[PDB]
Design a protein around this ligand. Sequence first.
Ligand code: 216
Lengths: 99, 99
Amino acid sequence: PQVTLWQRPLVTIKIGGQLKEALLDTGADDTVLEEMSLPGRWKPKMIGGIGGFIKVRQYDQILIEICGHKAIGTVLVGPTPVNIIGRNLLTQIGATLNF
Amino acid sequence: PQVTLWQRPLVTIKIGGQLKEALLDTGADDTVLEEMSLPGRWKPKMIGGIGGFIKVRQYDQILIEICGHKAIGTVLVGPTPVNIIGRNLLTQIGATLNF
Ligand SMILES: C=CCN1C(=O)N(CC=C)[C@H](Cc2ccccc2)[C@H](O)[C@@H](O)[C@H]1Cc1ccccc1
């Protein structure tokens, strides 16, 4: 859909069987979701924001349905306040920005 | 234009007669800018982010030109790694997210 930006662009995602809201974020290179339980193995990596660097777990090959469109990619879960869908998935869902 | 999200959506702003490069960021509610010289009539504020809080100077009624659309709004200057155009301005250049 076209989303305007008078409101936060939130979408439901279904991930790991769980349903969440998540912010569509063209500013973020990566997708980071708050702690939740995901299956599979995983690695520790850390990422920056404003404010500073949080430690996180890299999960690869993980399947998300984002607004129902589907996709697989790396998710980082860790201490965010908001679950963020960043350009690695926004690209598979085919998102664009138009001005 | 239409920005595809393979690469970061960087754009040039002219702000206070200085030329910067910034990120069009749909997940940020405000515009925050690295430290720079502004005509200093401003207030303390603190914005939150990933990985912590940072402390910013709030200026409003700043004219910004973000591509040749001028937009006027509140700008938070402060210790961010990257200049970020958030939704308060994007709505003013009319930007949309689409998929
Ligand atoms: C990867 C996420 C870090 N990040 C943030 O820290 N902020 C903060 C910007 C205001 C919000 C995400 C956010 C929104 C609301 C609450 C918490 C986080 C932006 O929307 C994100 O793109 C991004 C901007 C950024 C890019 C590169 C280096 C530093 C920062």
